Amino acid sequence: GGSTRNGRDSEAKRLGVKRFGGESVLAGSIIVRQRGTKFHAGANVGCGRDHTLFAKADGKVKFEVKGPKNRKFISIEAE
Amino acid sequence: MTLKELYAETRSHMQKSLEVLEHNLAGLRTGRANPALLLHLKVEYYGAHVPLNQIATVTAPDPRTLVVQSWDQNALKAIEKAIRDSDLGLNPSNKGDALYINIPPLTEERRKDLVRAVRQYAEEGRVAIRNIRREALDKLKKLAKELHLSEDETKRAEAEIQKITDEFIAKADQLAEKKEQEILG
RNA sequence: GCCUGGCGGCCGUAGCGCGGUGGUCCCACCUGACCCCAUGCCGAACUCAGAAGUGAAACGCCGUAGCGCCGAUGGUAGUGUGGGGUCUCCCCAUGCGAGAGUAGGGAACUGCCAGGC
RNA sequence: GGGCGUUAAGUUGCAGGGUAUAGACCCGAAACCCGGUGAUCUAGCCAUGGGCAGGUUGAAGGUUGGGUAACACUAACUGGAGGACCGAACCGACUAAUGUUGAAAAAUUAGCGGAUGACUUGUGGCUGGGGGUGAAAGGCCAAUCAAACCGGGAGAUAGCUGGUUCUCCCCGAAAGCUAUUUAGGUAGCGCCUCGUGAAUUCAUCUCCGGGGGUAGAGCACUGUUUCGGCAACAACCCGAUGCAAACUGCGAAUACCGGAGAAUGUUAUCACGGGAGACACACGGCGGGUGCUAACGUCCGUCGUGAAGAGGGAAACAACCCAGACCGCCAGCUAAGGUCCCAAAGUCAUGGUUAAGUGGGAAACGAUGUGGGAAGGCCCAGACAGCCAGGAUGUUGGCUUAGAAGCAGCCAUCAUUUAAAGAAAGCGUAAUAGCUCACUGGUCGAGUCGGCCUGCGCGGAAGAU
RNA sequence: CACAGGUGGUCAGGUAGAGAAUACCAAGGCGCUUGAGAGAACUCGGGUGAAGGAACUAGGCAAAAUGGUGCCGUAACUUC
RNA sequence: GUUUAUUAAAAACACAGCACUGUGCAAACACGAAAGUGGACGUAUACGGUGUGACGCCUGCCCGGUGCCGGAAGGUUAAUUGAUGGGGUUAGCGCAAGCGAAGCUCUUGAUCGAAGCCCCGGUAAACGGCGGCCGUAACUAUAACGGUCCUAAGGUAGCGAAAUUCCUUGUCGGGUAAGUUCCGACCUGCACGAAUGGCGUAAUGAUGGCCAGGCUGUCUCCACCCGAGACUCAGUGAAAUUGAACUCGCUGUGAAGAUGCAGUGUACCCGCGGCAAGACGGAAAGACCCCGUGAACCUUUACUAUAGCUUGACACUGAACAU
RNA sequence: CUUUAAUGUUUGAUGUUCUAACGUUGACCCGUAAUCCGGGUUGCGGACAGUGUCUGGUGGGUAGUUUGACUGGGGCGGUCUCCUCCUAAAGAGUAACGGAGGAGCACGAAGGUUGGCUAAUCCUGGUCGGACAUCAGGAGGUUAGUGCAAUGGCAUAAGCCAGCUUGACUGCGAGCGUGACGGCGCGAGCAGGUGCGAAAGCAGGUCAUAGUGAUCCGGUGGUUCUGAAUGGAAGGGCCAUCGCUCAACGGAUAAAAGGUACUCCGGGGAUAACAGGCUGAUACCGCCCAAGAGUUCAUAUCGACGGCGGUGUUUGGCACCUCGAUGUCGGCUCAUCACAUCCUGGGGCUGAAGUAGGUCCCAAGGGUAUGGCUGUUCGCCAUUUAAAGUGGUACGCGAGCUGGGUUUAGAACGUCGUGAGACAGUUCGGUCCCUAUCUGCCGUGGGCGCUGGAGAACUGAGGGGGGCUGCUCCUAGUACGAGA
Ligand SMILES: CN[C@@H]1[C@@H](O)[C@@H](O[C@@H]2[C@@H](O)[C@H](O[C@H]3O[C@H](CN)CC[C@H]3N)[C@@H](N)C[C@H]2N)OC[C@]1(C)O
Ligand SMILES: [Mg+2]
Ligand SMILES: [Mg+2]
Ligand SMILES: [Mg+2]
Ligand SMILES: [Mg+2]
Ligand SMILES: [Mg+2]
Ligand SMILES: [Mg+2]
Ligand SMILES: [Mg+2]
Ligand SMILES: [Mg+2]
Ligand SMILES: [Mg+2]
Ligand SMILES: [Mg+2]
Ligand SMILES: [Mg+2]
Ligand SMILES: [Mg+2]
Ligand SMILES: [Mg+2]
Ligand SMILES: [Mg+2]
Ligand SMILES: [Mg+2]
Ligand SMILES: [Mg+2]
Ligand SMILES: [Mg+2]
Ligand SMILES: [Mg+2]
Ligand SMILES: [Mg+2]
Ligand SMILES: [Mg+2]
Ligand SMILES: [Mg+2]
Ligand SMILES: [Mg+2]
Ligand SMILES: [Mg+2]
Ligand SMILES: [Mg+2]
Ligand SMILES: [Mg+2]
Ligand SMILES: [Mg+2]
Ligand SMILES: [Mg+2]
Ligand SMILES: [Mg+2]
Ligand SMILES: [Mg+2]
Ligand SMILES: [Mg+2]
Ligand SMILES: [Mg+2]
Ligand SMILES: [Mg+2]
Ligand SMILES: [Mg+2]
Ligand SMILES: [Mg+2]
Ligand SMILES: [Mg+2]
Ligand SMILES: [Mg+2]
Ligand SMILES: [Mg+2]
Ligand SMILES: [Mg+2]
Ligand SMILES: [Mg+2]
Ligand SMILES: [Mg+2]
Ligand SMILES: [Mg+2]
Ligand SMILES: [Mg+2]
Ligand SMILES: [Mg+2]
Ligand SMILES: [Mg+2]
Ligand SMILES: [Mg+2]
Numbered sequence A: 001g002g003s004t005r006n007g008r009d010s011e012a013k014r015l016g017v018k019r020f021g022g023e024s025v026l027a028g029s030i031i032v033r034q035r036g037t038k039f040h041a042g043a044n045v046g047c048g049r050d051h052t053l054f055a056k057a058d059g060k061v062k063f064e065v066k067g068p069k070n071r072k073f074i075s076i077e078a079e
Numbered sequence B: 001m002t003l004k005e006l007y008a009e010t011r012s013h014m015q016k017s018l019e020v021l022e023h024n025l026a027g028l029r030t031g032r033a034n035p036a037l038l039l040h041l042k043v044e045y046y047g048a049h050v051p052l053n054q055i056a057t058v059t060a061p062d063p064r065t066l067v068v069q070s071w072d073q074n075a076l077k078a079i080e081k082a083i084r085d086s087d088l089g090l091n092p093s094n095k096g097d098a099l100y101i102n103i104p105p106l107t108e109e110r111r112k113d114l115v116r117a118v119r120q121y122a123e124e125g126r127v128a129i130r131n132i133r134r135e136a137l138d139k140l141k142k143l144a145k146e147l148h149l150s151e152d153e154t155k156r157a158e159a160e161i162q163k164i165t166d167e168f169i170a171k172a173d174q175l176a177e178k179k180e181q182e183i184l185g
Numbered sequence C: 001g002c003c004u005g006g007c008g009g010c011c012g013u014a015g016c017g018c019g020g021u022g023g024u025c026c027c028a029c030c031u032g033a034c035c036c037c038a039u040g041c042c043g044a045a046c047u048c049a050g051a052a053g054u055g056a057a058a059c060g061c062c063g064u065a066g067c068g069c070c071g072a073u074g075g076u077a078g079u080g081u082g083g084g085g086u087c088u089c090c091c092c093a094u095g096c097g098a099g100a101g102u103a104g105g106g107a108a109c110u111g112c113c114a115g116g117c
Numbered sequence D: 001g002g003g004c005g006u007u008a009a010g011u012u013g014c015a016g017g018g019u020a021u022a023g024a025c026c027c028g029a030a031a032c033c034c035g036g037u038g039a040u041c042u043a044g045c046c047a048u049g050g051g052c053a054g055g056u057u058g059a060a061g062g063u064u065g066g067g068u069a070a071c072a073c074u075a076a077c078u079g080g081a082g083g084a085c086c087g088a089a090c091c092g093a094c095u096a097a098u099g100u101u102g103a104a105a106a107a108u109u110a111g112c113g114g115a116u117g118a119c120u121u122g123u124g125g126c127u128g129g130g131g132g133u134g135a136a137a138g139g140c141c142a143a144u145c146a147a148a149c150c151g152g153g154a155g156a157u158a159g160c161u162g163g164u165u166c167u168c169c170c171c172g173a174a175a176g177c178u179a180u181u182u183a184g185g186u187a188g189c190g191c192c193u194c195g196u197g198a199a200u201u202c203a204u205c206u207c208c209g210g211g212g213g214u215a216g217a218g219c220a221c222u223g224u225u226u227c228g229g230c231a232a233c234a235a236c237c238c239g240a241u242g243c244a245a246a247c248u249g250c251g252a253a254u255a256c257c258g259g260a261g262a263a264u265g266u267u268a269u270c271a272c273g274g275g276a277g278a279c280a281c282a283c284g285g286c287g288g289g290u291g292c293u294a295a296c297g298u299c300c301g302u303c304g305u306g307a308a309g310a311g312g313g314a315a316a317c318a319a320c321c322c323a324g325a326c327c328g329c330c331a332g333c334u335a336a337g338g339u340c341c342c343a344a345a346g347u348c349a350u351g352g353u354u355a356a357g358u359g360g361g362a363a364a365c366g367a368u369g370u371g372g373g374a375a376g377g378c379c380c381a382g383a384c385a386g387c388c389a390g391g392a393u394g395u396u397g398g399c400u401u402a403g404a405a406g407c408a409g410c411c412a413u414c415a416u417u418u419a420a421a422g423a424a425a426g427c428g429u430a431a432u433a434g435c436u437c438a439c440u441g442g443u444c445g446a447g448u449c450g451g452c453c454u455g456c457g458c459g460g461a462a463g464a465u
Numbered sequence E: 001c002a003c004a005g006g007u008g009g010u011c012a013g014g015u016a017g018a019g020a021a022u023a024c025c026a027a028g029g030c031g032c033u034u035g036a037g038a039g040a041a042c043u044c045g046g047g048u049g050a051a052g053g054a055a056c057u058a059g060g061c062a063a064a065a066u067g068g069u070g071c072c073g074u075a076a077c078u079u080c
Numbered sequence F: 001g002u003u004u005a006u007u008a009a010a011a012a013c014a015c016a017g018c019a020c021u022g023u024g025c026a027a028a029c030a031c032g033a034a035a036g037u038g039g040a041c042g043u044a045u046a047c048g049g050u051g052u053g054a055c056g057c058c059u060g061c062c063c064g065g066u067g068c069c070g071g072a073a074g075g076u077u078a079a080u081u082g083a084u085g086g087g088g089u090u091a092g093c094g095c096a097a098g099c100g101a102a103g104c105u106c107u108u109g110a111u112c113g114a115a116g117c118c119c120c121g122g123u124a125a126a127c128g129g130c131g132g133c134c135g136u137a138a139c140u141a142u143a144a145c146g147g148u149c150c151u152a153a154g155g156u157a158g159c160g161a162a163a164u165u166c167c168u169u170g171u172c173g174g175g176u177a178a179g180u181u182c183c184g185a186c187c188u189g190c191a192c193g194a195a196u197g198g199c200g201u202a203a204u205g206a207u208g209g210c211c212a213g214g215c216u217g218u219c220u221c222c223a224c225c226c227g228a229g230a231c232u233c234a235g236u237g238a239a240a241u242u243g244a245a246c247u248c249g250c251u252g253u254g255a256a257g258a259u260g261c262a263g264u265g266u267a268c269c270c271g272c273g274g275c276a277a278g279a280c281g282g283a284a285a286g287a288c289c290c291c292g293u294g295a296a297c298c299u300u301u302a303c304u305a306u307a308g309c310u311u312g313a314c315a316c317u318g319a320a321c322a323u
Numbered sequence G: 001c002u003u004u005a006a007u008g009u010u011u012g013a014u015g016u017u018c019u020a021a022c023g024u025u026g027a028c029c030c031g032u033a034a035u036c037c038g039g040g041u042u043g044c045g046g047a048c049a050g051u052g053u054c055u056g057g058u059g060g061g062u063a064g065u066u067u068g069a070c071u072g073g074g075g076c077g078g079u080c081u082c083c084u085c086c087u088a089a090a091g092a093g094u095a096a097c098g099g100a101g102g103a104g105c106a107c108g109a110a111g112g113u114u115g116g117c118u119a120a121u122c123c124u125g126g127u128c129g130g131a132c133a134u135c136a137g138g139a140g141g142u143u144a145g146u147g148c149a150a151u152g153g154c155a156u157a158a159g160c161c162a163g164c165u166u167g168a169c170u171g172c173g174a175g176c177g178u179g180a181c182g183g184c185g186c187g188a189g190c191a192g193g194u195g196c197g198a199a200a201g202c203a204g205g206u207c208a209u210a211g212u213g214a215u216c217c218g219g220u221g222g223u224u225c226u227g228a229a230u231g232g233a234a235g236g237g238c239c240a241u242c243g244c245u246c247a248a249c250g251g252a253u254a255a256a257a258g259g260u261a262c263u264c265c266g267g268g269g270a271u272a273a274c275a276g277g278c279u280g281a282u283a284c285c286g287c288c289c290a291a292g293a294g295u296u297c298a299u300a301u302c303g304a305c306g307g308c309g310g311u312g313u314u315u316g317g318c319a320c321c322u323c324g325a326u327g328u329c330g331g332c333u334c335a336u337c338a339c340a341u342c343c344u345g346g347g348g349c350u351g352a353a354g355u356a357g358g359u360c361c362c363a364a365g366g367g368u369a370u371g372g373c374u375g376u377u378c379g380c381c382a383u384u385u386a387a388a389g390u391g392g393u394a395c396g397c398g399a400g401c402u403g404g405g406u407u408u409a410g411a412a413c414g415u416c417g418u419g420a421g422a423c424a425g426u427u428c429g430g431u432c433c434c435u436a437u438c439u440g441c442c443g444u445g446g447g448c449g450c451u452g453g454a455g456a457a458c459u460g461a462g463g464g465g466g467g468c469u470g471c472u473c474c475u476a477g478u479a480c481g482a483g484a
Helices: B003-026 B073-083 B108-147 B151-183
Strands: B042-045 B048-051 B057-062 B065-069 B091-095 B098-102
Touching: B003 B108, B003 B151, B042 B073, B065 B073, B073 B091, B073 B098, B108 B151
Parallel strands: none
Antiparallel strands: B042 B048, B057 B065, B065 B098, B091 B098
């Protein structure tokens, strides 16, 4: 009694693990409530309201680490 | 104020009432084979009336003789001067560190007054205990109605209540029965 | 090749502490301040015009292991597939194999330009 | 720019799959509505006739006498009332038995109630169905009543139940998700079938590229927890030890996502469209919530099986082990499991254990059972057991206690004499006494004592044909 | 149903009796449309029981008992 | 007396008596769409309705809620009347913009408007209600007594462990050898209480409970006996049920209680009379339980309607006069 | 004419009088040797009453209906939508009536942008300042803070301050994420115009993830879209937007509470009750350690704190078998098994003098009470007894008996409900069916077989029946005992 309830779906993860077809703008990661869990960088960026790693122009997902104090950092180079 | 708390409450109140029972019982002269008889006997000493026990020792060597041992001699004297002053009509004997109080076979009249006292007290007790339930129950009705307890929860509570009551009644029953045997022995 | 400044690389064996050391080259601090511009007070910081002064501080170096940090070999836990014994647990075959800890490492290493010797 | 479109071959018959409206596969309600038929049963009432053997009680009124001023009042006799009394007929129905496929769809038998009355009965009439009638039970209204019966609306409706008829061939599920006055129904999605299209598409293995915070571990963080260190008892902090689903400065296996490649796989794959059924799952393995790490329990994840799978195995056993049945064969080999007989195959070989019918049910704990492996201690300055001797003094230690003298209890537990001798190990006394014990000397003449690592047994172990 | 049920009115003999109760008979009408044996447990309907007497049982259920006329006599209570 | 024809005869209904209330006659009411009819050829000592239920002693407190009775001054309010303002259109005025009468129209609702409701007073033999908390006396325990919270009022007389009492076999007394029943009490009345009457009460009762005497096969504890079946014979001649029967015990197994599976034990074949332990025996698609966007009656301040009752407007429907 | 009165007149309110409608269930006449009906006369009442259309109130008298679901049977209690975490086995996702919490909003700034700033806490030192007000230094390092849950994030700070503002803009949208769907979310960039800044740029609301309602039906503003002969207009469309704790939150109606024991129908053992089963926490029984009491003395007898089992036997849990019916408790009747033995039989220990006991072990042959009270079983009591055992057997036993309890229909009380009705409260009353085919028992025959057929008499493999016990005397008033 008076103990239940729960949220819902809300994925928030990687939808483009490593290099991908990465169209004009997929996601490669929608882990909202973040900035450092997946820092914006390289050709890719955006990171809209819901901290969703936008990912600009086409290419390939990178997944970095560059930058003082760890810091994930993602970007999308080309082939 | 919870079901459990109330539970502890009923048990408590009944414990107090039961204790009053023992108070009345021991305050009586069975076949007078009981040492508790003179326990509450507060005697004058140092300006105050100290309850005999905190001044002497009352033991029943045999069913026909009660003894009051007092570490203090002066207290022993004043103790005897207190074992009487009542319907007890006990005559303390001065010999050593204690008092020898022969329990004369009890008259049939005093036997009357005594057994009856045991019954009147017994029922009195029951009454209290029963009423205690009555109250506890009401409190339960207001509880289940207030906290919204499933018919099963509330009834269950009732069961617990009755249980407590029944036990105590049993306690008052025994005390009354044993005390009686003493008076009839 | 020495030293320094700016910009980055890489982000702890690159950090912290402790001691030595460098200077009117470069940095500092510093002089002054109506003025540009500045203080919810203050030329403290920002900002400007610049002596004298000095490396104190800050900083840049050198040594130093007390505190971080890195870290095996081996052994342990766990585990994918197969199999076996059992009350919840574990064993064997076989790949994978931490963590913690031990040995030890360790007082960064770099590229571009500029300025002095 | 983005959406919808752009030589998209249509269309009309015939056969068929589907759907809609209809009874729509078939059989079935309880009911609802309309129009009639019924008071020859029963319930009231109306009109008119009939009936109650016998026996009893004795009211009111009356007459005479008493009495009264007169009335009250009184006593005899007379009289003959009454939902009055007893009790046949008659009416009823309180009890029991028997009957219960009866003699009988309510009776028979032995008892029972009323019996001049709110009585009982024959005859005919009047009340009609949501209506009647009812000394009120929801009772009676034709063996029917919380709305009679007959015919019709009418094949009411039935997300429910049952059942659904010839043969062979190919494929072959689901018991899930999400919605639902939804929960045993439904609808889109999922899974099946069939057709039409499409690319190394899809799968497994190899390598390459990724993020990860589970197992595990750890204790900086959030809590929890000990033990020590600086706190007129403890926070903080220092170090040493643990704990966590909602702890993480560490971190697997692993799955998953993507790239490339070999082989293999009667396109396995993707899309569109016709046809479905299904949306109770069950067991077992592993990861788990709950529940008692209870249940042939319940709820998720995931795999296998059954469901929808026979055969062999486990005695017998949908799920578990093996293994997927096109058919015929009096052939051969194997899986699982087996090889003394029932009963197909070794009374097989080698070394060892076990002795309880363990095998072929069960724990904590208990015991010179017993097989193996390493290791220690004491000992011919005689070990180990038994046997002979000893075990004293201060002191009855102090306290306590009625007493406590080795032996209720508390404290102390030394010293002296020695070959040895506890302020004493148990029994015992009221307390002493007394007995045995430690330990010591001699005897005895070669090993003895317990632990450790492991294997097999024993007890503990009581149930109903 | 060739069914132990239901069905109104009329008549009213003799003995005993209060009697249309009941018992035996008159007139009158009948033996009930399967019979014969046997003489079990047990069911059914009954008769009788030593001693005891409600011990039965939910309960005296059911049985047993009581029974008539005249006279004697009859309590609490009472609306007499 | 009456009643569940066919499990309930009662403590139920009914009744004489009581009380309330409606009813002025063309009565109230009831049947009927209506005409009309019963009430009643009655007329308030009469008739209807409701509740109580001889008789005796009685019948307290509450009108806050609901209903009913009386008042309606004021507040609100139906149909109705339609003042008033807004709009469509268009003659004309105007390159035009826009303006716009009249008429026809769509809309607006002033104003008028009864009962009802609010409101005001009453009504309990109307429906219906009638309390909590704390303190105190010279044994103690107890509390007439005081105080405190709140009611529409706080249950009076009487009665109480009762057809009401859960705890419960309350405690006490009587009966008994022993009494969860019974009788008499106490009062702590879970949760009596005064006409949905309280307490009594002679007589009555196929009424509930308790006790006794008598009586007995009711029983201890059955035994005998007379008759009807049962049994044998002769004639006629059913029934339910029924997948197929070659229709054993046990122990296990198993859709979880086996004649049929496994293991085992046992057992020549078939009748007749008896018994009922099993065939989850026979009989009725469980009446309990739950489900169905099932059913039927029933209640009511569930909803939406409606007969009836009652309001006012206009109509049938007219003439005057006062204010 | 305006503000007021008078007379004319009109008309509205109340109120009186009148007759001529309308009524008359007064009287009389005729129809007519009528009680209806009609016409007439007279009296009464009289525009009232009454009826029609409309209309406000009242209206369980009646009528059609509603009155949810999940639910470890139903009910009760709770829940129903959205957000956060764990359950979630390191991608997404995943259940319970699992464990914990929040939301139904707040903001014209708490939005934007530019520029600047950085905490918490402690120590030390300071008027009042003290535990903690403000000030100075040091340590410290984000442990603060973030509008509100939880999570994650945040120093380039979202955290904090100020200046200027309206990007909380309009039209669109490469491409993705997520859903059955309806939808929902992210979005660089393009066009138009804005704001901040020198500028590079940033701004399509807030750190983000909750702060929610489809459709229909209408309301309002805009628009040459439409406009039924045509011109208009009404209305419809289109765009903007408003209205529902429709919260049972995919929202059946605008509108809905209940009772049934008077009940009924279709279904379910998909689902409770009984008894079987699985289980065995609980229950009963046994064992482990032994602090304690037992004078002393742990284990004669007993045992704390805690440990482990066994049984199927209680209280339960599950819902596997029966809901096209498996009759419930108690009694009666007749049993049958178990042994955790009550009696009797044999023993060990004793805190066993004896006689009597206490406790453990063995043992299932046989035996193991009548009444009172209640329906009871149980239980309490009276009196017996060698003893009055415990339990399995569908809590053995209804196709064997009863029918007292207990669940139909009657009725009543207390009680609750406006009420119908209701109660695991009470009270008085309340139809108990079956001829046995199969098994199995119990008895009794008919066959055939046992190797020629008989009449007999035995043997005895097996099987069953029966197995109780008191008291008195003698031993011996002895052993024993101080005596008793
Ligand atoms: C509990 N028993 C009580 C007893 O204690 C006594 O109680 C009264 C109580 O009834 C009074 O109460 C009275 O006054 C109240 C306003 N003050 C309103 C109620 C009214 N009865 C009290 N004022 C005084 C008590 N001693 O008298 C009545 C009684 C019933 O016997
Ligand atoms: Mg008769
Ligand atoms: Mg009679
Ligand atoms: Mg007739
Ligand atoms: Mg039709
Ligand atoms: Mg049909
Ligand atoms: Mg772990
Ligand atoms: Mg995973
Ligand atoms: Mg479903
Ligand atoms: Mg399902
Ligand atoms: Mg499942
Ligand atoms: Mg299961
Ligand atoms: Mg063989
Ligand atoms: Mg064995
Ligand atoms: Mg005949
Ligand atoms: Mg015949
Ligand atoms: Mg006799
Ligand atoms: Mg009788
Ligand atoms: Mg009847
Ligand atoms: Mg009857
Ligand atoms: Mg009455
Ligand atoms: Mg009465
Ligand atoms: Mg009254
Ligand atoms: Mg009484
Ligand atoms: Mg008796
Ligand atoms: Mg015959
Ligand atoms: Mg024959
Ligand atoms: Mg069996
Ligand atoms: Mg029979
Ligand atoms: Mg049957
Ligand atoms: Mg059924
Ligand atoms: Mg209705
Ligand atoms: Mg309908
Ligand atoms: Mg439901
Ligand atoms: Mg996950
Ligand atoms: Mg926010
Ligand atoms: Mg919903
Ligand atoms: Mg049914
Ligand atoms: Mg089931
Ligand atoms: Mg059960
Ligand atoms: Mg069963
Ligand atoms: Mg034994
Ligand atoms: Mg008896
Ligand atoms: Mg008994
Ligand atoms: Mg029967
Ligand atoms: Mg009964």
